[PDB]
Structure formats: C-alpha cells, structure tokens
Amino acid sequence: GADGVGSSSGNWHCDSTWLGDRVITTSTRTWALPTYNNHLYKQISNGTSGGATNDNTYFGYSTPWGYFDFNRFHCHFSPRDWQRLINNNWGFRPKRLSFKLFNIQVKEVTQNEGTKTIANNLTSTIQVFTDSEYQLPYVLGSAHQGCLPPFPADVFMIPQYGYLTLNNGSQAVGRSSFYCLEYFPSQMLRTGNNFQFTYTFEDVPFHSSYAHSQSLDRLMNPLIDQYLYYLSRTQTTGGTANTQTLGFSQGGPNTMANQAKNWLPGPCYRQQRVSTTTGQNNNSNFAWTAGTKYHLNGRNSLANPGIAMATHKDDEERFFPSNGILIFGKQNAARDNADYSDVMLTSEEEIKTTNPVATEEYGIVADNLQQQNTAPQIGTVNSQGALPGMVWQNRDVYLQGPIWAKIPHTDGNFHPSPLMGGFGLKHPPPQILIKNTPVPADPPTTFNQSKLNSFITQYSTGQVSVEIEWELQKENSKRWNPEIQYTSNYYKSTSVDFAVNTEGVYSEPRPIGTRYLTRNL
C-alpha cells in the first residue's frame, strides 16, 4: 500500500521462537531523541591544568548525533528464555540480525511565560545512517549506559555520540583526527517513513557454556601406575650419617603430584585479594595504589577487569580480587561511593579447573644454581605469559553483560577474546546514527552571512525493533546423576524476582552466569 500519515509504518514485535538448534528472539522498544549540543560540534578536553591527574587527560569532540546500543543481552532475552538457554545448551553463537525503525513522530515544544506546550510538526525530518565500512571511530564495546531497557514497557532516551583522539596534555597533536558526520550519505525520514536493514555475523566459535567435570591435573587413571620415573630422593635416610644420593619411583595412586602431565594451566597476571569481610581487610585506602595496573605511553592505566581467572579457591568466596571481577549495581544503587550491599558481584569459580586463581602465584621456579657448596633457592612467578601446551577458558558472559566487541584493526593480535567477555569480531554490527534536522527560526530581513544560531526547540520519538537469530549447540552427555540447574527460589517472598515492584520499577535481584551443564576434559 501507499504509506502516509494515516497508516502505521510497522507492527509491534517482541517475541521469541525455538526451532531445533535455532532460536530467534526479536524485540521492540520506544525511544525518544532530544537535540544535543544545540547542533554544534564541540571540542572537549581535560588536563592537569585543571584538577585532572595526568592519567585522565583527554581530547575529543561531542557531536550532536546519537546512536543505538543493543549490545547487552537483557535487551534480547527475557529471564525465562535465558533460563531455557543455559539449562539445555552447551554453546551458541549469533548468525544474522535484522533492524527496523518506524512510526516516527516529531514534536516542537515552546516556552511561553512560565508554561510549556507541545504540538505535532509534520514536515520536519530526521537523519539516519549506518556505517557498513567502519569508517568512524567505533564507540560501542565499552558497555556504556543507555542500552535498550530490559523491561519492554520502558521508554528510553538515546545517548549522545562522541569520541576521543590522540592527546598530549589537554592539547592535541598532528595526527589528531576530526570528523564531520553530515559528510556521509544518510537517508532522511518524515513521519511517513520506515528504515530497515539486515546484517550477518562472521563465523565465530560458539561461546562455551559449561563447567569441566574434571580438573586439568587429575586426568590420570587413579588405579594404574605410570612407567615414567621422577627424582624422588636426593639424600640417604635412616642412617646416622646421611649423604646425597639419587633415587626414583614410579608415579602412582599414592602420590599423584609427581606424575607426568601433558598440559599446563592458562596464563596468570596476579591481582590483590580483597575480603568481603571488612575487618579482615587491611585498614587503609590502598585501592588505587595497590591496584594492579599497566603502563602505556607514559600514562598509567588500571586493568579492568583483566584476563579471565578463578575468582577464589575452595570456600574462599568471601574473598575476591581487587578489579578482577565484574560488578553490577542493584536497582537504584547510589552512583558514587556505593556500599557493598547495593552491588552484585560475579563469581568465576566454575573455571577453577583450567585456570589459575587470580589471587595467587602461577608457579615456582629455582632462582640459583645448586652445588655441593651451595644451597638451592626458589622463586615465585606472579605474572606468567603464554607457553606451549597451555589451555584456558574465556571469561563468562552474563544476562546484563555485553554481547560483542569490535576487534581493533592491527598488525596482529593473540586469541581475540574480549576481556569483558563476548564475541570478538572483525566486523561488528554497524553502529547506527540519528539526529534531528535543524530547522531555523525566523531569519532577519537584511542579509547576513553569519550562520543562524536560533532554532525551534524540537524532539522526536518513535519505535525501534531488532531481530537476532541465535544458533545453538545441543548438549549430548551420558552423565548419570542429576545436573546442577538454575532455578528460582521455592520459598515465599514479599515480591517476585524479575517482576515489577510496588511502584513498577523493574529490577533484577541477581546476575546470571552462563555456565551450568558439565562436560569432560
């Protein structure tokens, strides 16, 4: 049919579907786009001239534009679906996504005296484009606020777009680059229009969701001896006078720590341990001083979180590494200086098999060279790079966590798995840009060259819908006993988890890990 003000552009779609190994989840939300920066690209910077420390100095611009971010899971999955997924499936990866944008309204608002009023401005337009060629600074992947709200009835504001560039102090160097967004082809829409496009994900390995039923070192047969020998004795025993001697034994059930092994744990870069029990921790503020940090370009940087590791060893749960773990705040938590009770901590315990504990050393090696004259010495490796024969697990993903991150384009990289967890991509989904078309006020009669700074105050709202087809990897396992599963609490409550509160403020009582089912090394 012929579209116009009368018809509606598109139909509300929020649904999921389960077909074999395919699962297709599409969502819809209601968005509102205000005008930013009064239609002005502005330089922003901060430096040691102000109260800024040398590390937080930046240089960049704030565009009038705005972008859409669906990168977080809880956009696309109800908790219920996210319950099925993690219970029955080993692994999954995305395939293709669709995007629709429709039912745009535009509204011009004025302030007369102390009152407000609003009306529909028909002829006005908005601009939309997507960079398929990745020709812009790619700002997604830092898990900024402002993704689509989990609970569909909500209506969200669209964030403002901006970017940073090479800085020296608060100043900028020659390679500093600048952009103009209006310099791209972009389609212009009025109230009678819609905008849609498709995308496909590159082949990416299925994200593993499961824990290893075994441990890396215990793969041995418990009953049978190895035929290899190790050096078990340097000294004669049982005599009144003991001298050095060489002696050996086979690795066997009694002593498994001496047996040969075919593989090594993953790499380790140590973190400082912090207790959830206040009294146990040292009395001081060490956070930034003792914080594990890495140094780049004469500029210090905290490593947040850092590479995937065990959070804690057996029954240590009250202990966690400083920055090592992700954190999620409970609903309406204080933004700053929030106390522990208002935040929710992830736990990596599932990977203790393969990967080392974040709070402890990797291993021990000898520092010196022994002699009949000299006593041998040992040394402790807190930070160990990658070695041949290492295996390791990526970091877990969470219902709130980011889905993907763009792999930077470089000469070369090593095992591109995003630290925050996700799917690294050579070619992420293209980021989408949108802006209100500036509409001038009444210009003067007499000519002037100066650009018109006055405008009609304006904003626009509409609908947005997003589709994703997730491929699954089904679980096939012969394990006899019942599995661990993710369930809701049976006991009564004052209110239901993941449901609206008294006032209709949706909240998530806890994060949800992705790993439950078990496999076998």
| Contact positions with a second copy (CB under 8 A) in 261-320 | 261-274, 276, 278-287, 289-290, 292-305, 307-308, 310, 313-314, 316
442 binding a second copy? (CB under 8 A)? yes
Dist. CA 303–CA 272, nearest whole Å = 12
C-alpha atoms less than 13 angstroms from C-alpha of 63 in its C-beta half-sphere: 21
How far apart CA 422 and CA 94 sit, in angstroms, is 11
Site membership for a second copy, residue 22 (CB under 8 A): no
3-state secondary structure of 348: coil
371 binds a second copy (CB under 8 A): yes
Residue 183 CB, shortest distance to a second copy, in Å, is 5
Among 178, 197, 175, residue whose Cα is nearest residue 99:
197
Query: Is 424 among the annotated ligand-binding positions?
Result: yes
The verdict on whether residue 47 carries a ligand-binding annotation is: no
> Does 247 contact a second copy by CB under 8 A?
yes
- Give least dist CB 22 to a second copy, A: 15
Minimum gap (Å) between residue 91 Cβ and a second copy: 18
What is the distance between the alpha carbons of residues 35 and 455, in angstroms, rounded to a whole number?
11
**Looking at 90, 405, 511, 513, which residue binds a second copy (CB under 8 A)?**
405
Region of residue 113 (left: phi > 0; alpha: psi -120 to 50; beta: else):
left
Residues 138-177 that bind a second copy (CB under 8 A): 138-146, 148-149, 151-168, 171-177
CB 477 within 8 A of CB 170: no
Buried-state track 179-201, b at ≥16 Cβ within 10 A, e below 16:
eebeeeebeebebebbbeeebeb
238: contact with a second copy by CB under 8 A: no
Nearest to 93 by CA among 35, 21, 171: 21
One of 48, 118, 317, 331 touching a second copy (CB under 8 A): 118
Say whether 188 sits in a helix, a strand or coil. strand
Selected binder of a second copy within 19, 239, 240, 448 (CB under 8 A): 448
Tokens standing for 218? Answer: 């215990």
In the list 96, 347, 473, 486, the residue contacting a second copy (rule: CB under 8 A) is 486
331 binds a second copy per the rule CB under 8 A: no
Q: Are 277 and 316 in contact (CB under 8 A)?
A: no
Structure tokens at 435: 């802006």
Q: Which is nearer to a second copy, 91 or 394 (CB)?
A: 394
> Which residues 177-236 are close enough to bind a second copy by CB under 8 A?
177-193, 199, 201-202, 204, 207, 211, 213-235
Q: Does residue 251 belong to the site contacting a second copy (CB under 8 A)? A: yes
> Under the criterion CB under 8 A, does residue 98 sit at the interface with a second copy?
no
48 near a second copy, rule: CB under 8 A: no
